Amino acid sequence: DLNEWIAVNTVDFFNQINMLYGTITEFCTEASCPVMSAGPRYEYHWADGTNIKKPIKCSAPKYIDYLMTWVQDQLDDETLFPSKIGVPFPKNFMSVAKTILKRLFRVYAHIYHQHFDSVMQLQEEAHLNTSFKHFIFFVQEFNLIDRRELAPLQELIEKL
Amino acid sequence: DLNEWIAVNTVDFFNQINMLYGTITEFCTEASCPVMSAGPRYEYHWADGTNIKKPIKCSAPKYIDYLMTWVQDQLDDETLFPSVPFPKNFMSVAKTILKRLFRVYAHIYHQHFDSVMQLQEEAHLNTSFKHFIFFVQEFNLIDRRELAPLQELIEKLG
């Protein structure tokens, strides 16, 4: 039962992230965001890694493209995300979910650090904060992300 | 803007409620739930439809089945939910869905909460319900009368 809960929430926040980033895609460009970052102090490199076992340094818009396509491919994988009650979860499912959530988190971090101005300009700060608050409470209860990965938003997390 | 927000949320709670109802679907039967209800004072009849008059009296299992099937196709409607601008009556449609999705929460709490706790899903249902109610409150997508069957509960979550 605990697995099913992790699954639906993983899908739900994934949908939430894509919507939120969608509202600000015009503000996230190669020129505005030449690299994946969450402030000057935190940069991320993409790797699948089965398709790419060497982390790639790329722009934020493109990484997010790799990320969202990668995540969705797993969500559509019945061996990982059972479409039938009669298909059990793989032994490593939690590990997979944790990996997705760890990377989905980075989208919040990038949006907050580089485009919070754009979020507010659109008057969507409450929705972003609402999405993030639900997200953080979910991962903390089930230890889906280690404290070291959450550093870029530690001060924010402390406030919520 | 706001339309995209209602869209993801409608889909998300559609997902949350289906998993949650899914956990107790075997314990919600024709014998246990001869009618769709949320306590003795609250009964529901299914209608789709147009000149709604004398709608259908059905079981809780069948009602909820009819519902999710109805909701699911609207979600799959590109003219309603662009995957193209949103249609003008979109809001009304979302409100009808959200209004009807609520009834599943109401039925579960009223008729199957014992099974939920035994299944150790009380926290999950409460979390889902809390988020759901907070979502509808911001834009009044369900009027206070429709929320009546869980008004006492709604008061504890807030």
């Binding site: 699954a7 949908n15 969500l75 479409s83 039938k84 | 889909v11």
Partner: peptide
Amino acid sequence: SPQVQRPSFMDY
């Protein structure tokens, strides 16, 4: 913008 749907419980 996917709005990924999990399955109807009756299918599941």
